[PDB]
């Protein structure tokens, strides 16, 4: 699931990975992975380091690094995108002004959807959270 990743994000993370590593391949012991995470600016605890080691004997391959960063940055980007898109519907109102106002935008647009299904699901962010669950 590398599609949730941004081109600039993957470029920056590859740049950091290339700067951290020494001569040779990127496969070094898990202590190197922990130190790279510390240098990247993140605050990974011992449990996060253990999970990253288990995901990847002391070989940090670019695919495994990309996968662990994919899951982490994907959770982070999902949270950030939810927070940003909470204010995406600026035309409906200032903030969650009316249930009918949001329902009109959600039913007149969004996807090929059934008119009665939107009303049934109604009975802003709460609807998105319910749909995600």
Residue numbers in the entry: 1 to 56, 61 to 127, 139 to 148
Paper lines:
Ryanodine receptors (RyR) are >2-MDa membrane proteins that allow for the release of Ca2+ from the ER and SR, thus mediating a range of Ca2+-dependent processes. Each forms homotetrameric assemblies of ~5000 residue long subunits. Mutations in RyR1, the skeletal muscle isoform, can cause malignant hyperthermia (MH), central core disease (CCD), and other myopathies. Here, a collection of cryoEM structures provides insights into the molecular consequences of MHrelated RyR mutation R615C, and how apoCaM opens RyR1.
Comparison of the closed WT and R615C pRyR1, both in the presence of apoCaM, shows that the mutation still results in conformational differences. As the Bsol interacts with the NTD-A of a neighboring subunit, this results in relative movements of the N-terminal domains, and downward movements of the cytosolic cap overall. Although the pore is closed, it is ~0.8 Å wider for closed R615C, as measured by the position of the Cα atom at Ile4935. Comparing closed channels, the R615C mutation thus still results in a pathological conformation, with partial movements generally linked to channel opening. Indeed, the planar lipid bilayer shows that the Po of R615C remains higher than WT even in the presence of apoCaM. ApoCaM can dampen, but not fully prevent a pathological conformation induced by the mutation, which remains more sensitive to activating ligands than WT. The C-lobe forms interactions with CaMBD1 and CaMBD2, and these do not differ between the open and closed structures of R615C pRyR1:apoCaM. Thus, upon binding, apoCaM pushes the R615C pRyR1 into the same two conformations observed for WT pRyR1, with one corresponding to an open, and the other to a closed channel.
